Design a protein around this ligand. Structure first.
Ligand SMILES: O=C1COc2ccc(C(=O)N3CCC(COc4ccc(F)cc4Cl)CC3)cc2N1
Length: 288
């Protein structure tokens, strides 16, 4: 009997099995009676779906059926931590889950909410099915390569290393760049389902693939979106948000900048977090 990496049997948990035969742990927040819409929540690198409890509960409050899974190599899902054969796996897997929920709740509009890496996944999912999603909520999505990490030198170095030693890694992120809310930083640091290990070279290449794929995908992207971004984000530079606003073809696009705020806007200072929740609430309400 298959168990999570934390040794809980999948038979005890909501789950699905992906096209690669890997078990992904699933999470649902269902309203009473008929939901108005579906929304998938797509987490970032190193994290898991459990970190979207509050957001998901608020959205369920609006009579949406919220669903999520932990990406392969994350959380309670199977796979070597923060490694993937190709970035598209993540997209393929989101689509499988979406397709399943649509089977079960047909005729309902479906939305995507993504943060960071999960934001890139959400963009690529929408690009793969033009015209299909009713909307996208992007919290500081991974949109461009960090300028010094993208130096053709290191990109060459990484590609070379990946064929000889892919399980070399770079530094753990400094967790204090995630949020000015030091309470939230502590929680990040003490969540056993978060992988805080350094970024593996083989994964970095896939993150570089994603950024490239997202940029190819922008001029063909038409889905309505709300984009939220902190001005002081050291992980996804605010410049990427302006690039997104400029390149997307979407007729319905809105950007909010949060002055001074870090990366994890939904776990930022209370004044930023309450704004985030409210804005998402309004934006999804008006489109359901
Ligand atoms: O709540 C949380 C918890 O901590 C988090 C940690 C990470 C993310 C996330 O998904 N990020 C940040 C890291 C960057 C790395 O980017 C690169 C690195 C190396 C390279 F060569 C190229 C690139 Cl493009 C990707 C996007 C999000 C959260 N959010």
């Amino acid at each position: 009997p298959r168990r999570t990496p934390q040794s809980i049997p999948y038979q005890d948990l909501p789950h699905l099995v992906n096209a690669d035969g890997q078990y992904l742990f699933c999470r649902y927040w269902a309203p009473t009676g008929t939901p108005k819409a579906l929304i998938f929540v797509s987490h970032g690198a190193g994290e898991h779906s459990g970190r979207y409890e509050e957001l998901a509960r608020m959205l369920m409050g609006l009579d949406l059926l919220v669903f999520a899974h932990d990406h392969v190599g994350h959380g309670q899902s199977e796979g070597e931590r923060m490694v993937v054969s190709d970035f598209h796996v993540f997209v393929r897997d989101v689509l499988q889950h979406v397709d399943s929920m649509q089977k079960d709740y047909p005729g309902l509009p479906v939305f995507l909410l993504g943060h960071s890496m999960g934001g890139a996944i959400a963009i690529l999912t929408a690009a793969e099915r033009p015209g299909h999603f009713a909307g996208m909520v992007l919290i500081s999505p991974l949109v461009l390569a960090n300028p010094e990490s993208a130096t053709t030198f290191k990109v060459l170095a990484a590609k070379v290393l990946n064929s000889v030693l892919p399980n070399l890694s770079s530094g753990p992120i400094d967790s204090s760049v995630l949020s000015r809310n030091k309470t939230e930083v502590d929680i990040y640091n003490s969540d056993p389902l978060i992988c805080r290990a350094g970024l593996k070279v083989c994964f970095g290449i896939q993150l570089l693939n994603a950024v490239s794929r997202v940029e190819r995908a922008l001029p063909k992207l038409t889905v309505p979106f709300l984009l939220l971004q902190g001005s002081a984000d050291r992980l996804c530079d605010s410049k990427g948000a302006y690039l997104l606003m400029e390149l997307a073809k979407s007729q319905d696009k809105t950007l909010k900048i949060y002055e001074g705020a870090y990366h994890v806007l939904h776990k930022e200072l209370p004044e930023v977090t309450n704004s985030v929740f409210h804005e998402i609430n309004m934006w999804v309400s008006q489109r359901t």
